[PDB]
Paper text:
In the complex structure of LicA-choline, a molecule of choline is located at the active site of the C-terminal domain, whereas in the complex structure of LicA-AMP-MES, an AMP molecule and an MES molecule occupy the active site. The MES molecule, which should be introduced from the crystallization buffer, occupies the corresponding position of choline in LicA-choline, whereas the AMP molecule is stabilized by the N-terminal domain. The morpholine ring of MES is stabilized by residues Tyr197, Glu213, Trp251, Trp254 and Tyr268, whereas the sulfonic acid moiety forms hydrogen bonds with Gln31, Lys45 and Asp176. The adenine ring of AMP makes hydrophobic interactions with residues Ile43, Tyr90 and I183, and also forms hydrogen bonds with the main chains of Glu89 and Ile91. The Fo-Fc omit map at 3 σ revealed poor density of the ribose-phosphate moiety of AMP, as reflected by its low occupancy. The similar binding patterns suggest that AMP and MES in LicA-AMP-MES might mimic the native products ADP and phosphocholine, respectively. Similar to hCKα2, the N-terminal domain of LicA-AMP-MES rotates approximately 18° towards the C-terminal domain comparing to apo-LicA by the program DynDom, making N- and C-terminal domains much closer to each other. The P-loop in LicA-choline is close to the active site and the residue Thr29 of P-loop interacts with choline, whereas the P-loop in LicA-AMP-MES is far away from the active site and adopts a conformation similar to that in apo-LicA structure.
Therefore, the choline kinase LicA is crucial due to its role in initiating phosphorylcholine metabolism pathway. Here we determined the crystal structures of apo-form LicA at 1.94 Å (apo-LicA) and two complex forms with choline (LicA-choline) and AMP/MES (LicA-AMP-MES) at 2.01 Å and 1.45 Å, respectively. The structure of LicA adopts a protein kinase-like fold which comprises of an N-terminal domain (residues 1–92) and a C-terminal domain (residues 93–283).
Author numbering: -2 to 284
């Protein structure tokens, strides 16, 4: 039983009646060590332990508010606990739920485009103002080692040069999810599709979210065009250039996230190296 699992057991004890007990806390699948299934006498809970070393990256109070603010959209699953002290989310467990991946997401544009419209047109004022270039600096501060990626100064300066272009185009400010990996979509056995894991949610340009959806599921040009056709409306305008720019910023940011996570003891192999190289590729294609 890990330290993280012991802390989870303690936090869940507050959700139980005098009779009930925590039976087990086990690590769920996935890339990171954040996700756990907790079993109690009469209840199962999905747990995301996101707080470890992320105090300066994920503003826990911002995100606790964002949960209660976003609840009536009906997109996320039910929350039972959001622990500010350690950064731990305790949610409902949906039995026999299907987690989406790139292939399955591509069959469900009829559901997913309206979902993204719902969030981007919510008119909700989330706590948090996403600043991608400040985000880069946050990771740079937290990382102890000499940056392990090749040709970093030239790449960094090219990435930071995109700030001026974004200012010229004009950056929009809407409620965004910020982390549209396909595995953040889960389907109930009865058919309802959820969008989960809003830990990064913030006010941002909606083209960030589109870039993330497209990049994280490796959409083809045909899939991008088809999705944009579905998603585009007067209240959800589309900018292809912004999408291209945000893809580069995402690969940069998540490559730095990788270094920091590995410094804390995780092993993601060449995940970060490859994302960084894709930023390099994107910079060349953009220019
Ligand atoms: N309410 C739920 N019921 C069943 N599985 C879930 C639930 N919420 C999250 N999960 C799973 O846990 C993962 C959450 O972390 P992530 O892998 O980053 O999406 C999802 O991919 C789902 O597979």
């Amino acid at each position: 039983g890990s330290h993280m699992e012991k802390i989870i057991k303690e936090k869940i004890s507050s959700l139980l009646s005098q009779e009930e007990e925590v039976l087990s806390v086990e690590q769920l699948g996935g890339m990171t060590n954040q996700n756990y299934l907790a079993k109690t006498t009469n209840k199962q809970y999905i747990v995301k332990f996101f707080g470890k070393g992320t105090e300066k990256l994920i503003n826990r109070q911002d995100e606790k508010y964002n949960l209660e603010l976003l609840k009536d959209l009906g997109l996320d699953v039910k929350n039972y606990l959001f622990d500010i002290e350690a950064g731990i989310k305790v949610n409902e467990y949906i039995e026999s739920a299907i987690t989406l991946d790139s292939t399955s997401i591509k069959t469900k544009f009829d559901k997913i485009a309206p979902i993204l419209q719902t969030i981007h047109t919510s008119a909700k004022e989330l706590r948090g103002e996403f600043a991608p270039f400040e985000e880069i600096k946050k990771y740079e501060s937290l990382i102890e080692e000499q940056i392990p990626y090749a040709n970093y100064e030239s790449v960094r300066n090219a990435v930071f040069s995109l700030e001026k272009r974004l200012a010229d185009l004009g950056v929009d400010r809407k409620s965004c999810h910020i982390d549209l990996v396909p595995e953040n979509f889960i389907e109930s056995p009865q058919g309802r599709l959820y969008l989960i894991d809003w830990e990064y949610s913030s006010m941002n340009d909606p083209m960030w979210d589109l870039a993330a959806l497209f990049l994280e599921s490796e959409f083809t040009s045909q899939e991008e065009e088809t999705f944009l056709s579905h998603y585009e409306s007067d209240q959800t305008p589309v900018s292809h250039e912004k999408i291209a720019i945000y893809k580069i910023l995402q690969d940069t940011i998540w490559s730095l996230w990788t270094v920091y996570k590995e410094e804390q003891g995780e092993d993601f192999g060449d995940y970060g190296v490859n994302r960084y190289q894709r930023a390099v590729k994107g910079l060349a294609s953009y220019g």
